[PDB]
């Protein structure tokens, strides 16, 4: 278990002096000699000398005799190496090794070869005071994929003394990584570069941040190597929203006719708001029924508009009795960007009711040559215009139909037409179609008229 342990790395300046230790064990310390060999960057190993623990006898290399001091301490089992007047060139790893076993058949010094070494101790000798690493991105540009991938990395330039550790994505990214060995600059600062190849596609999708470390200056840095944006302050200025209105504006809407007449549905009065600047998006509504306020309202979330405006809406599901009686509703809205509180009122269209006459009309003979025919429903004589027209057959609702809007007639009442389109076959198969009309001036607010091919078939 013959082992040799040396001191730790050290960093001196041009003129200082270093003293490295060398402690052994596993063998008789004063029964062997200790050599001292260094190896500077790019240089061959250099033997400096040797000292003998048993009698302190030491031989020096012509190149270090005048500057080295081999001093042993048998009590501690440690050999010391001391170099002084250290200049730059003296930078290197200084090892200490023990001679080999003095065999029987060998002559004096035949065993003086480096038998067991130590891990050496690095010694940097320069006039560069500690500094912090620089983190610059080696980002990929939009080059040609052709038949390959992309590469990006980090540059750790101008620091002292080394080392430095680099990782990508807090130890998540390892494969493909290549941290290059430091390079001492004419400035006396080490340079470094860590790179990684990754699929070209992932560029815009994956996040790559290299973690840089440099303990000597207790510095840490994490930079996101992001692909250089191909945009040079691409022209198109900040703060793109308008402002030439007496604040936002309000518009109110009444419930749908059928809803007010038929029970299956509940009345809904909508209050919409637009032109709600982004500087003041907060909106508040208030509801007054004939003056008497109520909070049973519900406000749907806000949405964004094309030209930088919002669409806030408050739907106050009102009641049949209220609406039909002529109850007056009011939606008051106030916004900070608005000078005055905008409030609007809504209520059922009043007027002397007139009972609608419903008439179904079969297809014209000429249209019978087509594959689809028109079943017509005429509704006339009604007032007010609020009405609902629906079509059904065999207990089910037809789909394909369109009703004209109410049209003012010669006498002040309204009339309209609803057109149901159905395949000629259904008409000829004798199916019975019926037009349902829902209006306030109808008994039970409901009436029906049927239509079907003359008896025949």
């Amino acid at each position: 278990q013959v082992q040799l342990v040396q001191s730790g790395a050290e960093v001196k300046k041009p003129g200082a002096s270093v003293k490295v230790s060398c402690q052994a064990s596993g063998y008789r310390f004063s029964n062997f000699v200790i050599h001292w060999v260094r190896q500077a960057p790019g240089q061959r190993f250099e033997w400096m000398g040797w000292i003998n623990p048993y009698n302190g006898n030491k031989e020096f290399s012509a190149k270090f005799q005048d500057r080295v001091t081999f001093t042993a301490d048998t009590s501690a089992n440690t050999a010391y190496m001391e170099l002084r007047s250290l200049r730059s060139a003296d930078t290197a790893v200084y090892y200490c090794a023990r001679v080999g076993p003095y065999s029987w058949d060998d002559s004096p010094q035949d065993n003086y070869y480096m038998d067991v070494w130590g891990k050496g101790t690095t010694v940097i000798v320069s006039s560069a005071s500690t500094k912090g690493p620089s983190v610059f991105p080696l980002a990929p540009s939009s080059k040609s994929t052709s038949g390959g991938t992309a590469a990006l990395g980090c540059l750790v330039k101008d620091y002292f003394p080394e080392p430095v550790t680099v990782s990508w994505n807090s130890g998540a990214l390892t494969s493909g990584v290549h941290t290059f060995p430091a390079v001492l600059q004419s400035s006396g600062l080490y340079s470094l570069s860590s790179v990684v190849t990754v699929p070209s596609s992932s560029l815009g999708t994956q996040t790559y941040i290299c973690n840089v470390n440099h303990k000597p200056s207790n510095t840490k840095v994490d930079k996101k190597a992001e692909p250089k944006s191909c945009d040079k302050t691409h022209t198109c200025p900040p703060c793109p929203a308008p402002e030439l209105l007496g604040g936002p504006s309000v518009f109110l809407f009444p419930p749908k006719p059928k809803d007010t007449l038929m029970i299956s549905r509940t009345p809904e009065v909508t209050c919409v708001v637009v032109d709600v600047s982004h500087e003041d998006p907060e909106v508040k509504f208030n509801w007054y029924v004939d003056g008497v306020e109520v909070h049973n309202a519900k406000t749907k979330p806000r949405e964004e508009q094309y030209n930088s405006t919002y669409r806030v809406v408050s739907v106050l599901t009102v009641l049949h009795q209220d609406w039909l009686n002529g109850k007056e509703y009011k939606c008051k809205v106030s916004n900070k960007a608005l000078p005055a509180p905008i409030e609007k009122t809504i209520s059922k269209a009043k007027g002397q009711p007139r009972e609608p006459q419903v008439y179904t009309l079969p297809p014209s003979r000429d249209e019978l040559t087509k594959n689809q025919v028109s079943l017509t429903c005429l509704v006339k004589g009604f007032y007010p215009s609020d009405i609902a027209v629906e079509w059904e057959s065999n207990g089910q609702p037809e789909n394909n139909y369109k009703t004209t809007p109410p049209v003012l007639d010669s006498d002040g009442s309204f009339f309209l037409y609803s057109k149901l389109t159905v395949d000629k076959s259904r008409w000829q198969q004798g199916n019975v179609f019926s037009c349902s009309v829902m209006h306030e001036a109808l008994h039970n607010h409901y009436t029906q008229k049927s239509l079907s091919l003359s008896p025949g078939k």
């Binding site: 050599h35 060999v37 061959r44 190993f45 033997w47 031989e59 290399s61 090892y95 080999g100 060998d106 010094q109 035949d110 003086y112 070869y113 480096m114 038998d115 067991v116 070494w117 130590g118 891990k119 050496g120 620089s134 610059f136 991105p137 080696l138 980002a139 990929p140 540009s141 939009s142 080059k143 390959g148 992309a150 590469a151 990395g153 540059l155 330039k157 290549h178 290059f180 060995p181 430091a182 390079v183 600059q185 340079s191 570069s193 790179v195 190849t197 250089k228 944006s229 191909c230 945009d231 040079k232």
Partner: protein, 215 residues
Amino acid sequence: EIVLTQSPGTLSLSPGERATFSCRSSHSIRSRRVAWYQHKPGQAPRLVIHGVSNRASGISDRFSGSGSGTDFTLTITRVEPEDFALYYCQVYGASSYTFGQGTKLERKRTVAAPSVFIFPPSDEQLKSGTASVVCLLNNFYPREAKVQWKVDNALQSGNSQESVTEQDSKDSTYSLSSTLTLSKADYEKHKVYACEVTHQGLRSPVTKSFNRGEC
């Protein structure tokens, strides 16, 4: 003095092959005081052979050193995976302690062309006054590769520095990263910035480039 010249510079073979290291000295070494050492990055050098031909304790009989007079050898019957390292020779004793320059036993693998990527100076860095133009050469083999810069087709020199990685543990390839460094003044007085790469795997010099501020 005694000068030891090792050969070959780099010895690349596949596991199982026979390795022979040469170490010639300017003087004859009749003392037979020749020794061989193995060295691995970060670890402590290890004695392999001593006295010309004597395995050190713990050395597989795979190793064996012979020679005399002016020429000495070291051979591995069959190369193992853990053998790939640096091998030096030296003459020792009687105040004659000198080493060889070392021979590198590397991993032999198929020829591989380098993937060359180039990166222009970072926007931020330009704030200081220095420009760092990097040029990568990814996972190539063998090691020998030439890198030339051309700023406006002007073969630069003496302003760049290289760096290389240890043979890749997995695919036995290397990667080099040259660095062009100028003043923000020079960088903004030229347009074409290329990095010419010549390799044993590239039929013709590959040139990756860009121009002063152009995405």
